[PDB]
Amino acid sequence: MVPPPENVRMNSVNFKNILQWESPAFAKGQLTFTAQYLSYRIFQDKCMQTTLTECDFSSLSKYGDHTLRVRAEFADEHSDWVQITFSPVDDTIIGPPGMQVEVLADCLHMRFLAPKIENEYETWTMKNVYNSWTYNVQYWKQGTDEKFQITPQYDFEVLRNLEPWTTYCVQVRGFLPDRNKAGEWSEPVCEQTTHDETVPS
């Protein structure tokens, strides 16, 4: 008899799908684990007898509805399977985009970086996966409480009409209009606008 893996869960962010678990209490020796995914009607091994407490399922089709299961093994015995279901496009967490902010005169200019997706074959970003990918920006004068919302047309934005030598804080997140799915907000970046007279040359 072998106890099953505990607290089994899918930790998926930006389509990096990591199945993770906790090793159960066991007195006889080192446990190994086998995790599988369903392909048509039969389960296929993804990680066979790994000594680790996680398995990378990033190769699962992003659009499919998957079923995964994992069990512990020792000697020639094995535990019961622990199974979960997972749909990447609907369940993966969309992390915060990156952001570069520059101050030009009394203005804040920003460029957004779409979260990347390393498939070990192609360098994709959320844009290659979601066709209606868009950004949502939110900013406010440091101190105040009124937050303003704006939706850039592309991967950059220019906040015009701002007060000189004033500090503003800005955040950005990805958004999928077609699915109403919002990604996580980036931590706020606060920058102080300067002045027309600051412009060199």
UniProtKB/Swiss-Prot annotation:
Disease the record associates with this protein: Inflammatory bowel disease 25, autosomal recessive: A chronic, relapsing inflammation of the gastrointestinal tract with a complex etiology. It is subdivided into Crohn disease and ulcerative colitis phenotypes. Crohn disease may affect any part of the gastrointestinal tract from the mouth to the anus, but most frequently it involves the terminal ileum and colon. Bowel inflammation is transmural and discontinuous; it may contain granulomas or be associated with intestinal or perianal fistulas.
Q: Where in the cell is it found?
A: Membrane
What Gene Ontology cellular-component terms does the record carry? interleukin-28 receptor complex; membrane; plasma membrane
Q: Quick one: a GO biological-process term for this protein?
A: inflammatory response
User: Residue ranges, Extracellular compartment?
Assistant: 1-201
Annotated source species: Homo sapiens
Q: How does it sit in the membrane?
A: Single-pass type I membrane protein
Q: In the UniProt record, does the keyword Glycoprotein occur? A: yes
Q: What is this protein called?
A: Interleukin-10 receptor subunit beta
Residues listed as glycosylation sites in the UniProt record: Q30, Q49, Q83, Q142
Q: Which family does it belong to?
A: Belongs to the type II cytokine receptor family.
| Boundaries of every Fibronectin type-III domain copy | 4-92, 95-197
Q: Which UniProt keywords apply?
A: Antiviral defense, Disulfide bond, Glycoprotein, Membrane, Receptor, Repeat, Signal, Transmembrane, Transmembrane helix
